[PDB]
Design an enzyme around this catalytic site. Structure first.
Site, PDB file in Angstrom:
ATOM      1  N   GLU A 127     -17.928 -16.080   9.979  1.00  0.00           N
ATOM      2  CA  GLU A 127     -17.079 -15.160   9.264  1.00  0.00           C
ATOM      3  C   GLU A 127     -17.908 -14.199   8.421  1.00  0.00           C
ATOM      4  O   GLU A 127     -17.388 -13.575   7.522  1.00  0.00           O
ATOM      5  CB  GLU A 127     -16.069 -15.923   8.401  1.00  0.00           C
ATOM      6  CG  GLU A 127     -16.707 -16.825   7.329  1.00  0.00           C
ATOM      7  CD  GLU A 127     -15.669 -17.644   6.567  1.00  0.00           C
ATOM      8  OE1 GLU A 127     -16.041 -18.640   5.921  1.00  0.00           O
ATOM      9  OE2 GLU A 127     -14.477 -17.293   6.602  1.00  0.00           O
TER      10      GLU A 127
ATOM     11  N   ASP B 129      -5.264 -16.814   2.848  1.00  0.00           N
ATOM     12  CA  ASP B 129      -6.128 -17.307   1.785  1.00  0.00           C
ATOM     13  C   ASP B 129      -6.801 -16.123   1.080  1.00  0.00           C
ATOM     14  O   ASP B 129      -6.467 -14.958   1.361  1.00  0.00           O
ATOM     15  CB  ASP B 129      -7.119 -18.369   2.282  1.00  0.00           C
ATOM     16  CG  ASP B 129      -8.239 -17.804   3.173  1.00  0.00           C
ATOM     17  OD1 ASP B 129      -8.394 -16.571   3.305  1.00  0.00           O
ATOM     18  OD2 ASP B 129      -9.006 -18.622   3.722  1.00  0.00           O
TER      19      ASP B 129
ATOM     20  N   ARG C 269     -12.896 -28.654   3.922  1.00  0.00           N
ATOM     21  CA  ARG C 269     -13.661 -27.420   3.779  1.00  0.00           C
ATOM     22  C   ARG C 269     -14.216 -27.347   2.374  1.00  0.00           C
ATOM     23  O   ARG C 269     -13.451 -27.166   1.423  1.00  0.00           O
ATOM     24  CB  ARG C 269     -12.828 -26.156   4.051  1.00  0.00           C
ATOM     25  CG  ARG C 269     -13.648 -24.853   3.863  1.00  0.00           C
ATOM     26  CD  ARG C 269     -13.045 -23.611   4.591  1.00  0.00           C
ATOM     27  NE  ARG C 269     -11.855 -23.080   3.916  1.00  0.00           N
ATOM     28  CZ  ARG C 269     -11.212 -21.967   4.281  1.00  0.00           C
ATOM     29  NH1 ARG C 269     -11.631 -21.263   5.320  1.00  0.00           N
ATOM     30  NH2 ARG C 269     -10.145 -21.557   3.614  1.00  0.00           N
TER      31      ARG C 269
ATOM     32  N   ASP D 208     -12.130 -12.891   6.423  1.00  0.00           N
ATOM     33  CA  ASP D 208     -13.407 -12.864   5.752  1.00  0.00           C
ATOM     34  C   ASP D 208     -14.391 -11.997   6.521  1.00  0.00           C
ATOM     35  O   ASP D 208     -15.109 -11.202   5.914  1.00  0.00           O
ATOM     36  CB  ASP D 208     -13.995 -14.262   5.636  1.00  0.00           C
ATOM     37  CG  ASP D 208     -13.857 -14.831   4.236  1.00  0.00           C
ATOM     38  OD1 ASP D 208     -13.923 -14.039   3.278  1.00  0.00           O
ATOM     39  OD2 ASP D 208     -13.653 -16.057   4.101  1.00  0.00           O
TER      40      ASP D 208
HETATM   41  O1  LIG Z   1     -11.295 -18.585   6.430  1.00  0.00           O
HETATM   42  C1  LIG Z   1     -11.011 -17.376   6.604  1.00  0.00           C
HETATM   43  O2  LIG Z   1     -11.808 -16.412   6.617  1.00  0.00           O
HETATM   44  C2  LIG Z   1      -9.447 -16.994   6.806  1.00  0.00           C
HETATM   45  C3  LIG Z   1      -8.603 -18.197   7.042  1.00  0.00           C
HETATM   46  S1  LIG Z   1      -6.759 -17.780   6.905  1.00  0.00           S
HETATM   47  C4  LIG Z   1      -5.913 -19.058   5.990  1.00  0.00           C
HETATM   48  C5  LIG Z   1      -4.614 -18.863   5.568  1.00  0.00           C
HETATM   49  C6  LIG Z   1      -3.945 -19.845   4.866  1.00  0.00           C
HETATM   50  C7  LIG Z   1      -4.564 -21.041   4.563  1.00  0.00           C
HETATM   51 CL1  LIG Z   1      -3.634 -22.252   3.669  1.00  0.00          CL
HETATM   52  C8  LIG Z   1      -5.868 -21.297   4.957  1.00  0.00           C
HETATM   53  C9  LIG Z   1      -6.536 -20.280   5.684  1.00  0.00           C
HETATM   54 MG   LIG Z   2     -12.870 -17.475   5.188  1.00  0.00          MG
END
Ligand SMILES: O=C(O)CCSc1ccc(Cl)cc1
Ligand SMILES: [Mg+2]
EC number: 2.3.3.9
Length: 717
Positions: free
Chosen positions: A424, A623, A331, A452
């Site tokens: 998102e 995150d 990513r 997000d």
């Molecule tokens: O991408 C988003 O909008 C939320 C994704 S939630 C997430 C939690 C923990 C880890 Cl290590 C990676 C992603």
């Molecule tokens: Mg995100």
């Protein structure tokens, strides 16, 4: 200074050196050509990149004004939708089409199962995730609350047989449900043999085969006393390990030691919201790990390495192999941020997303070549890049053009660089078909990035009125419509058997019973993959893909349209008089605590994802999107008079020591309290809320990055 001049670019030396010494050798790319490519792609695409960011601002200003200019209680959907169309926010939907993406691995096109996301700056975690393709079901059941710690069955310092027995029985039932015997239950098995290419299971008074002999994929050891038996169901492998000379094998009626499940068949190595990377040194740490993974030689302290493929005997007697590693995506960061890893002659920082494409793209070439073993990653020759936080089809097209240009610089075939589209952002959501079409020859997934997405929801209609509480958002009409609409768009564009249709993270790392009970909704909804926060949760989420025939679920959803544009556009406005005073205080504390809890690890320690205790001490692994939500919600409440700026301050001060105590088990931690104005972390939390309404689309990075850099500089002097 220390920088390297290349055209109009001034490349941080740590980066320049990493690329020349580590990334480039073995790619057959002429180093000088590469750097000239960097200079040229950055020069050519920077203006469009900036143009797209300005467009976001302009569209948001127009929406803010639209709301500010009216005072009617119910949103006239017809006028609202007309306005959004007029300003170019809601674009026309294109005719039906089928994606043409090719050269994609089976793990993505065909196999439905869990997908892990891990911070790429953490080498040990990344390695664990990559190795998480296969995982112990016994470990996952014993070690978590999926088997309740009732009386007699609790975890101790040593092995509890009563708990072990529950584990065994749970897994026997999984086997009955997933790979049914012709007669009887796996619970009464006494042994396993392979006779004339057929699996025979010994019962007390008889023997039997599988209800569906084709679920028998192979074995290890001798046919007449195998060491293990390999099964397959819904494209996922299940391995029964047989060994009576093991801890639990001795207790087991068939000598069974464990059941291994194929779990995380794909993993996203994250450079975005789960990592804290704010300068050249941080990016190089990330790039170095990504390189190690692709070359197959990443090794971490406590010595951890990547797994080899797994060897099997076919039912007939021939030999074969299965992938031992989770197939990797990376990513990249999105279109917003710059990073000082490269600046121009003006001192202007270069767009980080452009850099990510060049460098993670360059680096992924090693994953297509032999590891000194067979190549590590894509056998079909693809590079898989998840691209987050895009708003609308124009932003998707820009990414595809960026990838094209990078492909030229790298001497790669066009469309080698595939795109995982995160849905998102609301302008992507309501124009999703168009976003897929813009990437119709590169797209390998779409996914509902819901934390997000909720942040974007709040910012976009910030001027509309007070939003509902954070906990309420997950059940709001807009989000449930968003979820179905995403699936609908994917299937209609022909994702079934071509690309992943993905759903979001289970963030409650210790609540695994709850996950097993409820996350099953996602593959029942037609999702061919969903996010899990750890190898353990991957093994457990795998169960869901055995109970649910995703392929069939998708076929049945074909041609349905389960969400309208009106539903997507239903703003999560709280009703009049929604909350008592106590509930308001709870919600403020909740949000201030989640901001402080996350920000303090980010700013002080450069950790972007961890098990963070929430206000009720529930372990959450989120995150940076959790920051976007909480800060936007508080900013929204402050904006519309639900709370005062003293309420925010009081909550920040009330929650700061609580977060301090929650971090007691950490020697590097520095208490925020009581000298709040001396804590950059505390001031960062404050700033995110008080400046929240003014941040573009509520993005937290400009503030977070500045504060982290501020911390880094103070720690050196
Ligand atoms: O991408 C988003 O909008 C939320 C994704 S939630 C997430 C939690 C923990 C880890 Cl290590 C990676 C992603
Ligand atoms: Mg995100």
């Amino acid at each position: 200074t220390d920088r390297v001049s290349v055209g109009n670019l001034r490349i941080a030396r740590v980066l320049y050196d990493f690329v020349n010494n580590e990334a480039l050798p073995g790619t057959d790319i002429d180093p000088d050509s590469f750097w000239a490519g960097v200079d040229k792609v950055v020069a050519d695409l920077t203006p469009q990149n900036q143009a797209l960011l300005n467009a976001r601002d302009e569209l948001q200003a127009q929406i803010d004004k639209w709301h500010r200019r009216r005072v009617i209680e119910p949103i006239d959907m017809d006028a609202y939708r007309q306005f959004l169309t007029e300003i170019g926010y809601l674009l026309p939907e294109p005719d039906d089409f089928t994606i043409t993406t090719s050269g994609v691995d089976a793990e993505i096109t065909t196999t439905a199962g869990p997908q892990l996301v891990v911070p790429v700056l953490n080498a040990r975690f990344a390695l664990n995730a990559a190795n998480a393709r296969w995982g112990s079901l016994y470990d996952a059941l014993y070690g978590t609350d999926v088997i309740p710690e009732t009386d007699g069955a609790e975890k101790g310092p040593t092995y509890n047989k009563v708990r072990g027995d529950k584990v065994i029985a749970y897994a026997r039932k999984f086997l009955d449900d997933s790979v049914p015997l012709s007669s009887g239950s796996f619970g009464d098995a006494t042994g396993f043999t392979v006779q004339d290419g057929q699996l025979v299971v010994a019962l007390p008074d008889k023997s039997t085969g599988l209800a569906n002999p084709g679920q028998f994929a192979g074995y290890t050891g001798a046919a007449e006393s195998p060491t293990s038996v390999l099964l397959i169901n819904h494209g996922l492998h299940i391995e029964i390990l047989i060994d009576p000379e093991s801890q639990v094998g001795t207790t087991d009626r068939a000598g069974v030691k464990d059941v291994i499940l194929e779990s995380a068949i794909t993993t996203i190595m994250d450079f975005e919201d789960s990592v804290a990377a704010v300068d050249a040194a941080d990016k190089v740490l990330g790039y170095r790990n990504w390189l190690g993974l692709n070359k197959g030689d990443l090794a971490a302290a406590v010595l951890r390495v990547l797994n080899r493929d797994r060897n099997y005997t076919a039912p007939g007697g021939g030999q074969f192999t299965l992938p031992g590693r989770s197939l990797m995506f990376v990513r990249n960061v999105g279109h917003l941020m710059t990073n000082d890893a490269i600046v121009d002659t003006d001192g202007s920082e270069v767009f980080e997303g452009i850099m990510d494409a060049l460098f993670t793209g360059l680096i992924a070439i090693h994953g297509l070549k032999a590891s000194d073993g067979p190549l590590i990653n894509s056998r079909t020759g693809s590079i898989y890049i998840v691209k987050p936080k895009m708003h609308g089809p124009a932003e998707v097209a820009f990414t595809c053009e960026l990838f094209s240009r990078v492909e030229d610089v790298l001497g790669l075939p066009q469309n080698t660089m595939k795109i995982g589209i995160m849905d998102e952002e609301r302008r992507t959501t309501v124009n999703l078909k168009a976003c897929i079409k813009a990437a119709a020859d590169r797209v390998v997934f779409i996914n509902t990035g819901f934390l997000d997405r909720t942040g974007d929801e709040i910012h976009t209609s910030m001027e509309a009125g007070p939003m509902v509480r954070k906990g309420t958002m997950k059940s709001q009409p807009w989000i449930l419509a968003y979820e179905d609409h995403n699936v609908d768009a994917g299937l209609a564009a022909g994702f079934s058997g071509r690309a992943q249709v993905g759903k979001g993270m289970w963030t409650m790392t210790e609540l695994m019973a709850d996950m097993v009970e409820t996350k099953i909704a996602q593959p029942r909804a037609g999702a061919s993959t969903a996010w899990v926060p750890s190898p353990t949760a991957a093994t457990l989420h795998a169960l869901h893909y055995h109970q649910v025939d995703v392929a069939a679920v998708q076929q049945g959803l074909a041609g349905k349209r389960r969400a309208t544009i009106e539903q997507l556009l239903t703003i999560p406005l709280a009703k009049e008089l929604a909350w008592a005073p106590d509930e308001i205080r709870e919600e403020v504390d909740n949000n201030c605590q989640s901001i402080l809890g996350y920000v303090v690890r980010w700013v002080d320690q450069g950790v972007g994802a961890s098990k963070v205790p929430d206000i009720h001490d529930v372990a959450l692994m989120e995150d940076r999107a959790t920051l976007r939500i909480s800060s936007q919600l508080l900013a929204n409440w402050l904006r519309h008079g639900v709370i005062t700026s003293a309420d925010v301050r009081a909550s920040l001060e009330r929650m700061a020591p609580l977060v301090d105590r929650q971090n007691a088990g950490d020697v590097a931690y520095r208490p925020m309290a009581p000298n709040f104005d001396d804590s950059i972390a505390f001031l960062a939390a404050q700033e995110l809320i008080l400046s929240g309404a003014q941040q573009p689309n509520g993005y937290t990075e400009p503030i977070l990055h500045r504060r982290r850099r501020e911390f880094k500089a103070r720690a050196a002097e």
